[PDB]
Assembly symmetry: C2
Amino acid sequence: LGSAKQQRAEATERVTAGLREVLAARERRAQLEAEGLANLKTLLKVVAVPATVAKTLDQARSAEEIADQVEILVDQTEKARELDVQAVAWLEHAQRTFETHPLSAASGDGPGLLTRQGARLQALFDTRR
Amino acid sequence: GPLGSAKQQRAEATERVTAGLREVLAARERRAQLEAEGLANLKTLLKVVAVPATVAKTLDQARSAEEIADQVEILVDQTEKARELDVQAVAWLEHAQRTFETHPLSAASGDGPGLLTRQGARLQALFDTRR
């Protein structure tokens, strides 16, 4: 309505104000997300945190990084369950071996090397964890 | 001859004593050597099934069956403690998934699936408390 010159002045002003509006929103979003990340960590800590990830949890700079630490923990738990399987298998074999070997087996003179550890061993063996 | 035959008697008496010691010694030595063989073969038998690094690192070096037993107990210790950690980690992972699913920063929005979604399978696997 105003002028040839004033028409232009409003037209660009829409562009610059629109930019300011965009930047303002991004800024506000960053800081609330920072608050959200802070509070995410607080929530995650309500249940005891494995030392594995606790060592690094506070340092995570985003939710994505925490998810990564989660994925690490999952991998590690998978690998540990794999080793358990192997360890029980070897322990079963080792106990069998010891029980029939002249160097270890119980004799007339008392118990074998693994005797006093038998109960504990059987627990590990009995079909769980 | 007189001196000679007398001397050969002393020599024989001397040898009987030396032979007696040698006899006793040889028995001790042979027992040691056979127990050594036994320890070697014990390790060979033990290796027929894959040996955890806990025990494998030191097994060949073990000076007796007793040392191997010590290490066995360690392995048992480690396996106990590991099973304790499994319990704790599953507990936390459950809590973690529960939390991620309802949190604005991670939960699925209009723009796609949540952050942990792609881990759903593995997570559920671990959760269905096998092993």
